[PDB]
Write a protein that binds this ligand. Structure first.
Ligand SMILES: Nc1ncnc2c1ncn2[C@@H]1O[C@H](COP(=O)(O)OP(=O)(O)OP(=O)(O)O)[C@@H](O)[C@H]1O
Ligand SMILES: Nc1ncnc2c1ncn2[C@@H]1O[C@H](COP(=O)(O)OP(=O)(O)OP(=O)(O)O)[C@@H](O)[C@H]1O
Ligand SMILES: [Mg+2]
Ligand SMILES: [Mg+2]
Length: 1173
């Protein structure tokens, strides 16, 4: 990307935006790409703004205040431009205050007498033009500069909070939810930048209004005292309505946050939710809180209507309060009423528009500043000091607990030398991870000293994968090597299956490694830890998804031979690992039973324990069209009354002009939308949003997996978060306001033109010139905006991803790397945003300069060919001056509404997203022949020529090497992937049946468990069509009853996503309980014994096999002891399945990839008949 031309440019160029010319011209001809857009300017880059603000905050915190404030630190580095651009806004708006007099002098000097003055018109008219043009010359650069400042504020705050959250402690990290932290940023991103202009009026409006009322006080009469009182009542009425919005608006945002949290859950675990068949249920779950939300929006909109309507209706009321009282005292003045009128309106504008919008921001921003200040002042993580003098780890009397400092760990003692491996072991929730967390330095111990050498590696229990390549995750910062890398891949047994992929290496992985298998994520995450050089290695249960063979090989080659002379701590429950290892550690409820060698354990007493966009929008709701006709017809007859109404006065009455000023001044109220006229528009434009949301959610949730796995979570979520909240909240009032301003201006321009026709002559040429200039901007800008909104998604997806696997980032000390990566994703965004914002200012500035030509040629053409002896064509200068003052505000909306309307197309893409359009037999007979499955169309084959059969209600066993396709078979059976064959059930297939009914036949328990936010009632049965004792029966049946009884509100216990409330094993136990209640013939089981103890499986199988009495089951496990119960067996090979009756046949037919792998305990029972001859 070439450097930004803004730096290498003239002042005159940067002021008038001449540098923008090429990028517009290129955008006009052809379509733009992310390659085409410029680099960000060097002044407002990420690294400089962060380094700036942090210093002032550091010293402000370091000074030792009673309460450190962010404003005091912030103000010291942003005061200079704020006041400098602020001064221009004051002198700019102060221009208005002197308009009444200059306007008032020419209209005064119209009819004093015929002869005294000639020059007065032209001099003061040219002066009015000079004074007018001085304003927007003075005013426009201030806005741009002051916006651009707000961008520099927001980039610094995103940077410093990210730097903070990366070093935030684990005790407090669990308390803070991710959704609210993201949603805090997602709302502000755009709004906060643009909002500063309104906020600067907090001292402008009070200073101006006192000077304004001081000048209108030149009216001695109490008449003036009556006139101003109309502004005060309106002003308090405005702020009164803003109060009533508060409790409704505040209560709604909370109710929104529930939905955005739930949509994030359902769409992250989108693979599982389809397999059960929970579309309409989830749609219903979303529809309730959605139904509750819209009810409040109606009230927020209805109050926000009168907020707008009271402003437009007040022109009639305010104007009569000046003139009619003055009729009592020294009546019908020559020129004082016009001055008074102009002072009355400019005052009204300030109280109605500026000051509420000013105190709107300051009241909002202080709470934002309070929360960030609170967030920056939280518990900080301590980095481990590295020193070489210590060579082996030392613990003594370690006691520790989460959120209290009963204890999690209690008085641990262990003494490990260099070049030794320890074996941690125990039951569910014994505290095996917490011991690693204390050694790691994440959890701080309360009473007990813990000492070690600094550098540590760590492999997590739930392995996570970065967005990039397999190489990137294995290397993970460190440089590439020839045989180091290869020895790790060879040792970790990741070489064969990696070669089998379509691309050899460097496969671009989706969110969380969905394109990789369950076991591969463990081995790649292992390899990561193996590849680096460190003193201590912590492997927290790496062999949970691996086979017996791969485990055996990895344990012999990788753990023993390759890591020889490295200290290891491995979590496991296998006799052979415990036997080979040096020292054992047996936890139980946070306290240790035994600590020593294996023969010493045996000598002890416990022997062995274990228009297209608009037409589609309007046509979605026909009720809005029946309103749209009403607005056009009434406005036309409202116009008809004014056209005819003037002539009645003009005929009775050269000097038929001063009434035209009052009409133009009074126009807004005459052409306003009444109570019956305006409210139906707001009602219909809400109801459309309720449907338009409900259509999208249904369309997105029912689509094929190849299309869904193409898209990331953020790309989808960005439609729900921003674009839906835009069309919900903002669009109704802006689309209301747009019609008003067009009807007023177009209505007014026609009727002022009908009198004195040749004023129309000036407007014909440039209006079309203006419309061309708009179409010139809209081609390049609107297109550039869509790039900016896509550039928003990588920020939050990078933020939220960082919080999931933060524990590793700390272990590998890669925090600075992620900051650098985070700034790159910002700089690409701000480049786009800065460019777009500049191209808007070009158009906005060109709109004003274009206005000067209309004005002067209207002045030049409107002139006496003969002697204009009344003169004062200046009054036409005055009529044009005021009417087109609001035209800038009318245009200002035109860009906002149109650009914001293009967010609707993004929804319309998702609505039109490609999708798929007797008693079911007790006989659970299933056969498959010549099946072939593929994930991506026109890609590689995962299965090829698969053929097998299962007997009616028979127990079948599936085996195979890790990454053979055991899950993909279940995806093929359930139709989540492309297939070529004929799967049969009772001599029936999908020829007649739809997918819905085909899905209800099965009972799934997937690899990845899915437990969403809500109570256990909603988890165990989302429909809600079961008895309590029926739920208690299955809780006893599964072997999950007691652990529920220990909780408060036993069955209505608030269960969060992730967390620590239930252990991993319990999440499987829940996932089984789903399939109990499902009531299906066929059951698909993808590794039930994942994080289950040997003790739990025996008590499971005892009671579980009487529940599943009359139903077929398809198991797929690496553990043998759960598997050996079932009848038939089938193994998965390179291509296809080959079947066997018994284990004796299976293991002997298999070529010692399982026979020589199973331990002496199964070789006790297996060779019993041969050896016991
Ligand atoms: N990060 C955490 N924050 C707060 N509490 C936690 C955290 N991790 C675990 N806990 C709680 O403390 C207990 C410690 O058990 P822990 O999960 O360490 O045992 P474990 O052997 O790692 O579990 P598993 O057998 O599932 O691997 C858990 O039962 C849980 O309730
Ligand atoms: N979502 C996916 N998209 C594309 N390819 C996939 C996907 N999931 C798996 N694969 C491919 O299929 C192979 C293994 O499939 P699968 O995950 O069904 O095996 P598995 O038996 O479930 O693995 P494990 O035994 O580790 O659980 C891998 O080599 C992988 O490339
Ligand atoms: Mg654990
Ligand atoms: Mg699998």
């Amino acid at each position: 990307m070439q450097r930004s031309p803004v730096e290498d440019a003239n002042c005159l160029s940067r002021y008038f935006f001449w540098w923008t010319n090429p990028i517009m011209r290129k955008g006009f001809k052809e379509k733009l790409r992310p390659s085409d857009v410029y680099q960000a300017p060097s002044q407002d880059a990420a690294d400089i703004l962060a380094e700036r603000l942090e210093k002032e905050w550091d010293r402000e915190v370091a000074s030792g205040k009673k309460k450190p404030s962010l404003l005091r630190a912030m103000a010291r580095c942003y005061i200079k431009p704020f006041l400098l651009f602020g001064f221009l806004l004051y002198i700019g708006e102060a221009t208005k205050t002197v308009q009444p007099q200059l306007l008032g002098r020419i209209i005064a000097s119209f009819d004093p007498a015929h002869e005294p003055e000639r020059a007065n018109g032209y001099f003061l008219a040219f002066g009015l033009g000079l004074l007018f043009t001085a304003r927007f010359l003075l005013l426009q650069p201030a806005m741009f500069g002051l916006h651009h400042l707000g961008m520099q504020i927001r980039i610094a705050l995103f940077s410093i909070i990210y730097k903070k959250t990366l070093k935030l402690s684990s005790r407090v990290l669990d308390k803070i939810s991710t959704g609210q932290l993201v949603s805090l940023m997602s709302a502000n991103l755009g709004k906060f930048d643009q909002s500063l202009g309104m906020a600067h009026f907090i001292w402008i409006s009070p200073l101006q209004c006192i000077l304004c009322t001081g000048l209108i006080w030149e009216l001695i009469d109490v008449n003036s005292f009556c006139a101003l009182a109309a502004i005060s009542l309106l002003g308090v009425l405005q702020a009164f309505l803003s109060h009533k919005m508060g409790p409704y608006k505040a209560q709604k945002v909370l109710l929104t946050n529930k939905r955005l949290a739930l949509t994030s859950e359902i769409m992250e675990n989108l693979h599982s939710v389809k397999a059960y068949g929970w579309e309409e249920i989830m749609e219903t779950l979303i529809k309730n809180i959605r139904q509750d939300e819209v009810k409040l929006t109606r009230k927020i909109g209805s109050l926000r209507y009168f907020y707008s309507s009271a402003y437009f209706f007040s022109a009639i009321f305010v104007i009569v309060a000046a003139v009619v009282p003055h009729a009592l005292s020294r009546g019908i003045n020559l020129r004082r009423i016009f001055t008074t009128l102009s002072y009355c309106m400019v005052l009204r504008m300030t109280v109605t528009r500026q000051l509420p919008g000013s105190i709107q921001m300051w009241y909002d921003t202080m709470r934002l500043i309070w929360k960030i200040e609170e967030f920056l002042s939280k518990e900080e993580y301590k980095l481990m000091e590295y020193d070489l003098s210590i060579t082996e780890l030392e613990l003594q009397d370690v006691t520790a607990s989460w959120d209290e400092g009963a204890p999690v760990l209690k008085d641990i003692s262990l003494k490990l030398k260099k070049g030794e491996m320890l074996a941690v072991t125990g039951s569910m929730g014994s505290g095996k991870s917490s011991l690693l967390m204390t050694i790691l330095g994440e959890l701080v111990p309360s009473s007990g000293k813990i000492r070690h050498s600094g550098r540590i590696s760590y492999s997590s229990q739930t392995a996570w994968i970065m967005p990039g390549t397999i190489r990137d995750n294995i290397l993970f910062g460190l440089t590439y090597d020839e045989y180091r890398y290869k020895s790790v891949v060879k040792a970790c047994q990741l070489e064969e299956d990696l070669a089998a992929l379509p691309e050899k290496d460097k496969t671009p992985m989706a969110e969380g490694g969905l394109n990789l298998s369950g076991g591969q994520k463990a081995r790649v995450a292992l390899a990561r830890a193996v590849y680096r050089d460190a003193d201590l290695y912590l492997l927290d249960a790496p062999f949970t998804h691996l086979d017996i063979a791969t485990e055996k090989e990895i344990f012999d080659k990788c753990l023993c031979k390759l890591m020889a002379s490295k200290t290891r701590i491995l979590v496991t429950n296998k006799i052979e690992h415990l036997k080979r290892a040096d020292k054992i550690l047996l936890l139980h409820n946070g306290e240790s039973f035994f600590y020593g060698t294996f023969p010493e354990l045996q000598s002890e007493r416990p022997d062995f324990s274990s228009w297209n966009t608009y037409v589609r929008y309007v046509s979605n709701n026909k009720s809005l069209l029946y309103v749209l006709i009403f607005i056009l017809f009434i406005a036309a007859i409202e116009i008809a009354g004014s056209v005819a109404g003037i002539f009645l006065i003009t005929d009775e009455l050269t000097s038929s002009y001063y009434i035209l000023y009052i009409y133009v001044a009074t126009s807004e109220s005459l052409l306003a939308m009444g109570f019956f006229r305006g409210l139906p528009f707001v009602h219909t434009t809400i109801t459309i949003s309720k449907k338009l949301h409900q259509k999208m959610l249904h369309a997105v949730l029912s689509a094929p997996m190849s299309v869904l796995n193409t898209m990331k979570t953020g790309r989808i979520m960005n439609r729900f978060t921003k674009d839906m909240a835009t069309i919900d909240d903002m669009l109704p009032l802006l689309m209301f306001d747009f019609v008003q301003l067009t009807v007023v201006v177009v209505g007014c321009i026609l009727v002022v033109s009908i009198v004195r026709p040749y004023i129309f002559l000036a407007a014909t040429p440039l209006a079309i010139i203006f419309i061309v200039m708009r179409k010139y901007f809209l081609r390049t800008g609107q297109q550039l905006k869509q790039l900016e909104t896509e550039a928003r998604s990588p920020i939050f997806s990078h933020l939220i991803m960082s919080l999931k696997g933060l524990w590793t980032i700390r272990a590998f000390e890669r925090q600075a790397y992620f900051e650098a990566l985070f700034h790159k994703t910002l700089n690409t965004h701000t480049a786009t945003w800065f460019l777009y914002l500049s191209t808007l200012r070009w158009f906005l500035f060109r709109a004003d300069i274009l206005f000067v030509f209309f004005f002067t040629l209207a002045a030049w053409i409107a002139v006496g060919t003969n002697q204009d002896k009344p003169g004062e064509i200046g009054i036409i200068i005055c009529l044009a001056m005021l009417i087109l003052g609001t035209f800038q505000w009318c245009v200002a909306t035109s860009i906002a509404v149109d650009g914001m309307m293009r967010s609707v197309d993004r929804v319309f893409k998702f609505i039109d997203l490609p999708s798929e359009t007797s008693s079911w037999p007790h006989r659970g007979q299933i056969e498959v022949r010549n099946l072939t499955v593929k994930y991506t169309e026109a890609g590689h084959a995962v299965l090829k020529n698969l053929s097998f059969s299962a007997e009616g209600r028979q127990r079948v066993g599936i085996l195979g090497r890790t990454g053979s396709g055991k899950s993909s078979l279940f995806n093929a059976l359930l139709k989540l992937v492309y297939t070529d064959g004929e799967i049969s059930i009772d001599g029936v297939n999908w020829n007649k049946m739809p997918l819905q009914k085909w899905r209800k036949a099965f009972g799934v328990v997937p690899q990845k468990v899915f437990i969403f936010t809500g109570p256990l009632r909603m988890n165990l049965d989302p429909y809600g069509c079961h008895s309590d004792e029926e739920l208690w029966r299955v809780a006893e049946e599964v072997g999950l009853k007691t652990v529920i009884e220990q909780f408060p509100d036993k069955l209505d216990f608030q269960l969060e996503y992730g967390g620590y409330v239930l252990s991993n094993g319990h999440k499987q136990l829940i996932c089984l309980a789903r399939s109990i209640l499902s009531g299906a013939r066929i059951l698909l089981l993808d590794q039930p014994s994942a994080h289950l103890d040997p003790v739990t499986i025996k008590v499971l199988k005892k009671t579980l096999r009487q529940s599943f009495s009359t139903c077929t089951i398809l198991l797929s496990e690496h553990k043998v002891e759960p598997l050996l119960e079932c009848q038939s067996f089938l193994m998965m090979d390179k291509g296809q399945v080959k079947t066997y009756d018994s284990i004796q046949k299976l293991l002997n037919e298999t070529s010692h990839l399982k026979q020589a792998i199973s331990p002496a305990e199964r070789l006790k029972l297996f060779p019993r008949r041969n050896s016991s001859m």
